[PDB]
From TrEMBL:
CDD domains: RhoA_like. GDP binds at A13, C14, G15, K16, T17, C18, K116, D118, A159, R160. InterPro entries: P-loop_NTPase, Small_GTP-bd, Small_GTPase, Small_GTPase_Rho. Mg(2+) binds at T17, T35. Keywords: Cell membrane, GTP-binding, Lipoprotein, Membrane, Metal-binding, Methylation, Nucleotide-binding, Prenylation. It comes from Aspergillus fumigatus (strain ATCC MYA-4609 / CBS 101355 / FGSC A1100 / Af293). It is a lipid-anchor. The keyword Membrane applies. Belongs to the small GTPase superfamily. Rho family. This is Rho GTPase Rho1.
Length: 182
């Protein structure tokens, strides 16, 4: 039995829990419950190998800054997430999340994950951001941040539509199988 540990971090409401549950359970949560700390598990098949990937969900809320790092030890891959309909959430990837991850997870592969990809072209979302002179995050913007934080890959996904959800955890599992070779 091959076992690896994934930890997902990023701003509150950036869409971490919905990504984990859609990958592992296969249904979008009908109701929104802010996370404190939860652990899931998913069978991931990449390159003929079956990996039991432990999904360590964390609190994006800054009120839970203190106890969040208890999730990090013995991690094999880190997903730092942001919401594509929130440029501010991509800022916090650089301003908060990379500093924390690097304090506790020296030498790990990081996948930068743009969540809520379905909201980029959402006419409702575009109109609402345009009111505050904001635009949804572009793939080029995520690509530059990926490069600046030294993230291995940048992947865009939508838990809502299940677009690019599998590609996130397949890349994460491959990365985790390199981090530890036993
Ligand atoms: N449109 C869209 N909405 C999403 C998606 N994923 C999550 N959401 C919405 O965003 C909100 C936050 O979802 P959630 O996954 O709980 O964020 P989180 O990062 O876990 O939030 P927290 O526990 O750190 S406070 C919810 O209202 C949910 O419906 C997505 O892929 N597309
Ligand atoms: Mg959550």
């Amino acid at each position: 039995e091959i076992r690896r540990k994934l930890v997902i971090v990023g701003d509150g409401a950036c869409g971490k829990t919905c990504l984990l549950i859609v990958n592992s359970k296969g249904t979008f949560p009908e109701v929104y419950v802010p996370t404190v700390f939860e652990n899931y598990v998913a069978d991931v098949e990449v390159d003929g190998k079956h990996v039991e990937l432990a999904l360590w969900d964390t609190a994006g809320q800054e009120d839970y800054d203190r106890l969040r790092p208890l999730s990090y030890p013995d991690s094999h891959v880190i997903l730092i997430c942001f919401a594509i309909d929130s440029p501010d959430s991509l800022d916090n990837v650089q301003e908060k999340w990379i500093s924390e991850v690097l304090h506790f997870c020296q030498g790990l592969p990081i996948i930068l994950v743009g969540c809520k990809k379905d909201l980029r072209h959402d006419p409702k979302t575009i109109e609402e951001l345009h009111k505050t002179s904001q635009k949804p995050v572009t793939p080029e913007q995520g690509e530059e941040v990926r490069k600046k934080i030294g993230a291995y890959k940048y992947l865009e996904c939508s838990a809502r539509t299940n677009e690019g959800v599998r590609e996130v955890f397949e890349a994460a599992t491959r990365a985790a199988l390199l981090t530890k070779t036993h």
